[PDB]
mmCIF file of N, CA and C in Angstrom:
data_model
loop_
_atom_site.group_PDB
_atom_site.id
_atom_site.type_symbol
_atom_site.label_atom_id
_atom_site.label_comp_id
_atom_site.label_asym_id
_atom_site.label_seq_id
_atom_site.Cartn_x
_atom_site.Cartn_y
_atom_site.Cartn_z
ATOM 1 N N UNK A 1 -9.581 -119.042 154.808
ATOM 2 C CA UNK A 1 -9.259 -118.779 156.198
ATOM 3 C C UNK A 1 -8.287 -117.627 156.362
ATOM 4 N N UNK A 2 -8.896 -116.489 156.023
ATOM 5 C CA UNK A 2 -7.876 -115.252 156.478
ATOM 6 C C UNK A 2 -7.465 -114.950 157.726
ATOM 7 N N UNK A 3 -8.369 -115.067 158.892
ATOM 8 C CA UNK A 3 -7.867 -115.562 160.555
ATOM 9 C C UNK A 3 -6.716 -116.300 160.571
ATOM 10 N N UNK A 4 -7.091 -117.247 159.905
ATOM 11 C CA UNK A 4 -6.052 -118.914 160.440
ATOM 12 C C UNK A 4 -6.333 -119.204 159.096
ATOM 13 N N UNK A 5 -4.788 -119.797 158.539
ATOM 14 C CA UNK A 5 -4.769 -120.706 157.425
ATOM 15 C C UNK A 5 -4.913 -121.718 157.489
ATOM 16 N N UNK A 6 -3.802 -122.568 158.438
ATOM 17 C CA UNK A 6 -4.499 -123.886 159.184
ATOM 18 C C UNK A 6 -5.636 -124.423 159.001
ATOM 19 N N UNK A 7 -5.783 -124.926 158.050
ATOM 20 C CA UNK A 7 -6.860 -126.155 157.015
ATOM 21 C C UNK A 7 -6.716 -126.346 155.998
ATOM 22 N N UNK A 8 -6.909 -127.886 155.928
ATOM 23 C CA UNK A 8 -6.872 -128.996 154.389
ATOM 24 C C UNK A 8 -8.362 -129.305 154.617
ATOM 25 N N UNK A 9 -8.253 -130.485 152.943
ATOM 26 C CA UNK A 9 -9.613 -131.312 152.941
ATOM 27 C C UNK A 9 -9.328 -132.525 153.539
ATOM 28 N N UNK A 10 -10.397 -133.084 154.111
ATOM 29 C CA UNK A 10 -10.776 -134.298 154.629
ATOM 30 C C UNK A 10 -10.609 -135.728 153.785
ATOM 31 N N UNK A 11 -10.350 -136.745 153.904
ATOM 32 C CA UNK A 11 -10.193 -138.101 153.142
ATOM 33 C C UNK A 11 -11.342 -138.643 151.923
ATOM 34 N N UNK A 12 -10.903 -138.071 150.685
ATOM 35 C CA UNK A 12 -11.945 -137.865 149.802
ATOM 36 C C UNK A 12 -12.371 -137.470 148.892
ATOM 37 N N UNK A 13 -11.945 -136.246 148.419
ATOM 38 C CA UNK A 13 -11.981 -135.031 148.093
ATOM 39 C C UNK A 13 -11.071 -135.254 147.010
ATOM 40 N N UNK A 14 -11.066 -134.493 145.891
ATOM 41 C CA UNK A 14 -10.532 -134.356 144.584
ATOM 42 C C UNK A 14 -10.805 -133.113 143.533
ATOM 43 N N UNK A 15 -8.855 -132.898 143.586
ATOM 44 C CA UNK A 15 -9.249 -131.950 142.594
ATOM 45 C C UNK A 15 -8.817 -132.034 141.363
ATOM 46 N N UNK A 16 -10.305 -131.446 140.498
ATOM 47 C CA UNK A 16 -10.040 -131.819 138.938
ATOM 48 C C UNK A 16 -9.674 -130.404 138.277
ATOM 49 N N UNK A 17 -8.968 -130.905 137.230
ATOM 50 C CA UNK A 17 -8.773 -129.597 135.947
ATOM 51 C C UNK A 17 -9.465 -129.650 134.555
ATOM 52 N N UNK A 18 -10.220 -128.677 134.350
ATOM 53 C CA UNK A 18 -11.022 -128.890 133.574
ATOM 54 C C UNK A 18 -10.951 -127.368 132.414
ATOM 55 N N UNK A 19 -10.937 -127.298 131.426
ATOM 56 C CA UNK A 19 -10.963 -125.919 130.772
ATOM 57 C C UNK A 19 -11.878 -124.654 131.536
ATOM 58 N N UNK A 20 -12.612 -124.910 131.589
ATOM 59 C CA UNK A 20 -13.929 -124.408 132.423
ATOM 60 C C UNK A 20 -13.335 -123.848 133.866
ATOM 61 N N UNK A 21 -12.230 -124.963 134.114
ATOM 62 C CA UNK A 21 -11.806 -123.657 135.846
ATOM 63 C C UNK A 21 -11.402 -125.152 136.658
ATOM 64 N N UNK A 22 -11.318 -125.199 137.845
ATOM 65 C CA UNK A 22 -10.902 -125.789 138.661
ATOM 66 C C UNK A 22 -12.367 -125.531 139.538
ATOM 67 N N UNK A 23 -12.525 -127.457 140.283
ATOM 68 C CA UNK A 23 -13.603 -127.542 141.106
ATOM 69 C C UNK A 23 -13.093 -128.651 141.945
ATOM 70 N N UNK A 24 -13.751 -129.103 143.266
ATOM 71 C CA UNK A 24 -13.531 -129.503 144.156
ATOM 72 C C UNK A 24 -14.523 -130.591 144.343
ATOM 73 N N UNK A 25 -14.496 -132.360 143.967
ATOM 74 C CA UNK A 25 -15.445 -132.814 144.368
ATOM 75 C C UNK A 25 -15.290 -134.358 145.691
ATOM 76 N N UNK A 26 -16.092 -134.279 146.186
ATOM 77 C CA UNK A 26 -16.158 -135.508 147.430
ATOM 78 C C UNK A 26 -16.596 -136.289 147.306
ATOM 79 N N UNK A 27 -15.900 -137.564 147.033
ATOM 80 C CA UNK A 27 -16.246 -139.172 146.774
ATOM 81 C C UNK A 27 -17.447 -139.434 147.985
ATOM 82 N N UNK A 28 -16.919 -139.783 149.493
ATOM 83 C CA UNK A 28 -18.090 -139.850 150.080
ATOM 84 C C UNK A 28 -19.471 -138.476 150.669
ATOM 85 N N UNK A 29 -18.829 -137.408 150.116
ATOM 86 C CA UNK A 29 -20.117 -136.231 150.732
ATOM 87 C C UNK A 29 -20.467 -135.881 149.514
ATOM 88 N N UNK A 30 -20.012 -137.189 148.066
ATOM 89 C CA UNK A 30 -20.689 -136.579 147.102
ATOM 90 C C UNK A 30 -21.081 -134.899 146.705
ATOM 91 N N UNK A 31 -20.501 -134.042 146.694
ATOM 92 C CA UNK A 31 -20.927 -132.422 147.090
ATOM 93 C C UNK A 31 -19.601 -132.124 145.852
ATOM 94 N N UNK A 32 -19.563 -131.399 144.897
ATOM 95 C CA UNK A 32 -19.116 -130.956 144.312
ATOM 96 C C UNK A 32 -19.057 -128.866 144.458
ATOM 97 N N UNK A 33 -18.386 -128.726 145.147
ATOM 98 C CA UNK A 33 -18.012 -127.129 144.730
ATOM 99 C C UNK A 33 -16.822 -126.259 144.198
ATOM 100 N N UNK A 34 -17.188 -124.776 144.321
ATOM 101 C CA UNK A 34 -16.200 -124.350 143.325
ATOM 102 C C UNK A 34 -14.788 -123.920 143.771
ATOM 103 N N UNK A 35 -15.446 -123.866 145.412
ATOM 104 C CA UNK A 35 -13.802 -123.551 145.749
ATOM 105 C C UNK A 35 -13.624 -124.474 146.841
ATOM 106 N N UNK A 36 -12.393 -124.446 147.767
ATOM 107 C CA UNK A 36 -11.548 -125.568 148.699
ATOM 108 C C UNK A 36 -13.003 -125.911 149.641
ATOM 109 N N UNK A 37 -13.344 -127.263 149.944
ATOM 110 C CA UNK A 37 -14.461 -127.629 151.217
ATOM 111 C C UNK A 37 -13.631 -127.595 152.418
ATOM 112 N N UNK A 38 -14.607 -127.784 153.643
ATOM 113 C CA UNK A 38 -14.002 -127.975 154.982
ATOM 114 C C UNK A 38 -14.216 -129.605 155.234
ATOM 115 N N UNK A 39 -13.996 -130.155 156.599
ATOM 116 C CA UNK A 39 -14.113 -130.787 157.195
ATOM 117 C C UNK A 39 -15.626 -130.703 157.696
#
């Protein structure tokens, strides 16, 4: 959000550390990506 920073993740969401890099995954939207999700 280069406009507006103003945003987090939603109730869910987890971030792991892994050798490989840092990823972003969602218990209930199930959706795993590589960088921060929205709402």
């Amino acid at each position: 959000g280069s406009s507006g920073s103003s945003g987090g993740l939603p109730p869910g969401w987890r971030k792991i550390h892994d050798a490989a890099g840092t990823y972003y995954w969602h218990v209930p939207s199930g959706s795993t990506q590589w960088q921060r999700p929205t709402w």
